[PDB]
Amino acid sequence: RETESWKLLESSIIYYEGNPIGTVAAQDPELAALNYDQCFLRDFVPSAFVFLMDGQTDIVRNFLIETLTLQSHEKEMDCFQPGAGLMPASFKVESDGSKEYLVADFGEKAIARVPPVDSCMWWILLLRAYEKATGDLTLAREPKFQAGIKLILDLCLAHRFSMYPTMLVPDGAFMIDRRMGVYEHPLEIQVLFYAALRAARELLLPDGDGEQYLNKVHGRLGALQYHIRNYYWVDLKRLREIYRYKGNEFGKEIANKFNIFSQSIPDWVIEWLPEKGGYLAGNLGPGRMDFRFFALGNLMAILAGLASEEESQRIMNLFAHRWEDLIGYMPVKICYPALQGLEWQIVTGCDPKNIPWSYHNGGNWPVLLWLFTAAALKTGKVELAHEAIAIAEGRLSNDKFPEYYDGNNGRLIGKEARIYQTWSIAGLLVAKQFLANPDHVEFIS
Amino acid sequence: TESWKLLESSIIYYEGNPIGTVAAQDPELAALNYDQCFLRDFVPSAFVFLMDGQTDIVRNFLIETLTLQSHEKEMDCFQPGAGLMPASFKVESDGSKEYLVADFGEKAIARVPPVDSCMWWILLLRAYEKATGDLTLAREPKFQAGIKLILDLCLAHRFSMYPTMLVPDGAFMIDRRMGVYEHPLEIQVLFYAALRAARELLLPDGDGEQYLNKVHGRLGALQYHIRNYYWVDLKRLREIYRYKGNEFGKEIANKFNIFSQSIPDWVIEWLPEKGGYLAGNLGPGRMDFRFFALGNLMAILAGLASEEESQRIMNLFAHRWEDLIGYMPVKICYPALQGLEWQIVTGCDPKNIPWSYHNGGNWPVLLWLFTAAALKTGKVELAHEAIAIAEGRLSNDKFPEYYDGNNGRLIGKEARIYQTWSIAGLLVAKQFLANPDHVEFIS
Amino acid sequence: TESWKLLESSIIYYEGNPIGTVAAQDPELAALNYDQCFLRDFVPSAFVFLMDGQTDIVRNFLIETLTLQSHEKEMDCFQPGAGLMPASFKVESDGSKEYLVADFGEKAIARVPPVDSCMWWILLLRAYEKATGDLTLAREPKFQAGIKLILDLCLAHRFSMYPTMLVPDGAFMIDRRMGVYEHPLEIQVLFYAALRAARELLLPDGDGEQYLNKVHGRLGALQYHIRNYYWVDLKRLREIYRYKGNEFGKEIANKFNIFSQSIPDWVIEWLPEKGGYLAGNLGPGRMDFRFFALGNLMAILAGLASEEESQRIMNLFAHRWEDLIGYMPVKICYPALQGLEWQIVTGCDPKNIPWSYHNGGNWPVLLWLFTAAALKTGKVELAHEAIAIAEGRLSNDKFPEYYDGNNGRLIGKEARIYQTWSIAGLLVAKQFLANPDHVEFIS
């Protein structure tokens, strides 16, 4: 409470009719406001965890209520309506004369019109975190909330043309909200999908059509976990198998179901893995396996229990063995390796914000520290959590809590990073609070 | 003729009745899935049979595929939407007993979803009705239910603001990984056309009215979106080229955040003054400027493109004839992904090397769409020329599945011979030429 | 042991007698030519049998291959030299009757010539005699005639000033297009070794003296040429790097006109101070700086390299252990051809992608040569380590033909399992380790 960071977090709070309802993304005094003066649903999560652990839960309750109201608001682009269940990427408070009102971005204001797919999942997860932290079960059981959950599930569980139980998205549909070759079936979306289904199973009442929703949830839940665990898992044993796959196999009972051509498996993968390491791949689809390591997807896979115990140990072993690549001078690298040269051009459409080792394209993101700490505590690798926190702690305050860091090893402050980025401040606080009392990790697991 | 006899021998029979045609009758290559009837491949065969007058095979096909729609489809305990039509099917027997076996994507190479198959089914059902006058078929409760299941799948709520359909890579005629994921033109145009057909085929009875309302609504949004965002011409390119990056807000010009420095050099030089086309794809940070022939030709036929847009697409074909027709109509898409682009986008797919197969190969089947579109736009002479090019080679080459090279000079690297829709494509084109009124069945 | 039982089941029988061993016993892959006994592959099998004491199979092999040498070999009316030994052979039957069928290059993929096979035959005949003490075999007129035919082919006059042997690409263990055309080290070293063996095996009777004289003469010139022009160390690299281009005349330093700007960057950093090796190739305007393991190890064993050179090759292995042994001894050559170099040099050969198969793959069979060379140079501890690496994986992996990756971590992309010379290689290495005196049979 008396810390510098806590006071920065307090100033970030957004008020609405005299009540705290969220936090701004950043308080950078110089850069263009752009959309950084808005409360992003994904950014609020670590803020919420600080507030819940501290004991002031009104802000989180208020956030959940107002975002539920935003769900019923109308969204249009060229006058077409998406599903009613879509949660917004972000919102802020405006005022026309005397009265305050909330304005939101559901993707129709967003740069590149990216859909905030992860936002509705984070909302479910935060609702669950709220329940477990406070003990207040009544909020989620209110008819409003039940309906809101169900609208999210309608979109998530929408019928597919394909045989894949994964969720299909366009590029830039999560924390990585720009064109980064994370289209189709990105790990992060699948892991958050799995976690949200697990949560919905706790939150849903069987009343009315509730039993119908639970049925839909449980069927997808098992299929999704099987699919991810069996086809996304990468280790040396599995790589040896994939590398020897024959191409152009037709039929049900074939090994190479997705028609991966082993001559396309990148050079770096084979040398990068340690004997006792492993990870969930970045993406899988027709003719495609994305071997990039994505930190958020893997860490949440440990916390949500999607990964098995052994798989969770092997992910942490990878972090230990490739510490320079994945932590370096600032935890945690968002994905590894960076897209470079002509691959950057082709995959990102020459996006100047995502040059090699910058931002989404292999930058290091302080916020991810809270996930890493949680995961390290859960797998009983506390020493890793401690070293990671020590690294971040030695720079963040001095650098004024940047949004992200750049370079192979995170040496540079992010090229266009906002300073006083709220989830960089909150991430460090959450990590320290988890370390001080490891039982609080149960809020997210 | 030689072609008719070949088409006849391709017919699959089931309990004594014709129900479809095999993809190819190659004497030497591995069967793989080429001994099956593909829903997309059967379309031109069906047209031959409809115009000839033997319509039983088409009626039977429509009935058997409807039945297949209700088959149990599964991979590792997951079910797709109930409306999904198969990629293909064949007949198998246990002793005396015969039964149909289908690939819904669970057997398919790379597990690609046959998203186009359900749209082609609706279009063929409409073509059947218009051509025969048999209104009894589509009216049947089973057929009404079947159309609706497809609409349930096509119109299911999504996360994005736009009304286009989201698909994985390889979801249509291009059924391998080719960077046609997200919002490929072919899917959007087939979707539009299928919706227009559904509008005519749905009975109002019960919830039919609800379906018709949703269809009408989507048709409007879809036509607007496609025409206003996919259309490429010199004037539009000048606009896009001058777009500012990283615009945030509802009221911005560069909504999808295209960076003009990434616009390929070939595009600006390739378009003639009076030419234009619908782009291959659109999504976050992405515009695929490749020209896709099927999408563009079907846009003309379905009335998705305006009359002027249709004329400008045909102007493009005339001006860039060597590129898009060359020695074999029609080039499936232009230009080819080359070098490291081929590696990155296809995952080093050996069947789609540059200027081969899906990656800028030339496909004889497309001649029937080109001929239809040419007739509709009043470019009869282009139809004559394209038909003359194909007829000069196909028979001598034993009707290859596809041709390769910048200008289609090579027989396809792995092309099957006696590919059914290559034979049916030529026949259909000549039938249309003889009686242009038959173009109505697909327009 | 498991390995012995596997080696036994690989034996080919012919009219009731053992005459060779199949290349692999893969339960699943296409036979291709892996159901044949290769002359090069049989060598380590032969050594196992010689050291065990069952020498009939080796005697029978030598006899049957000699007979094959006299078989009619043809492609489009052209005959090679009469001394050519086959790449491989197998047994076939017409009803009850059995007969041998051989591949001399006329069946081979890419029509590659098995130049190494005839040299391996001579070396095995010498190994047989030394190990058994049966001097009656090589003395037979038929065997004398057979040795001479091989020498006629090896020593036939050529156009070049140097005494090395000119070959097309893919003429040895590396039997595919890998830029090992012209004067590859392996051929020159095997040639030298075969000549040394021929010196012991030839009777003086009749023209035997003439042959012995030519052999003696070539041995001298060949050893000088190889040692003085193929040897690479830091001191030599400093010389070559400072060579002037386009020197004309007898008395010039840069005889082969190597341009020092073309010397690859990796070479200078890779060599340790006390390390060195024989280069992979030499010819007009060309020095192939790739390290080739078989050539270098056989140079040690045949006494072609000096004692110091032998120690410096072993120093290279110790210093660059991860590169040359890694997780599976031994890397066939280093480094891999990559990117456009792979395309240009291999013609985009899919079996030889970077760090795979011939193109920098790791080959268990080579362990027997490495162990022999290590014993001979007094580096017993390196032998122990390499053997420990292989034994920790081969049985669990079902004895793959080869391993892939920079450090041999992958099982070979298209590796057959139960590859005979992988099994025989390990057994031979352990046999040598137990009794180093047996190294004499190949030295």
Ligand SMILES: OC[C@H]1O[C@](O)(CO)[C@@H](O)[C@@H]1O
């Ligand atoms: O609206 C989407 C935009 O929002 C950001 O997260 C911050 O401005 C960008 O990464 C993205 O382009």
Ligand SMILES: OC[C@H]1O[C@](O)(CO)[C@@H](O)[C@@H]1O
């Ligand atoms: O099952 C899908 C496969 O079917 C084909 O159309 C023909 O074999 C291929 O293009 C594709 O990979």
Ligand SMILES: OC[C@H]1O[C@](O)(CO)[C@@H](O)[C@@H]1O
């Ligand atoms: O016939 C020559 C062929 O035999 C092989 O050794 C095994 O199939 C290949 O390396 C080569 O291409």
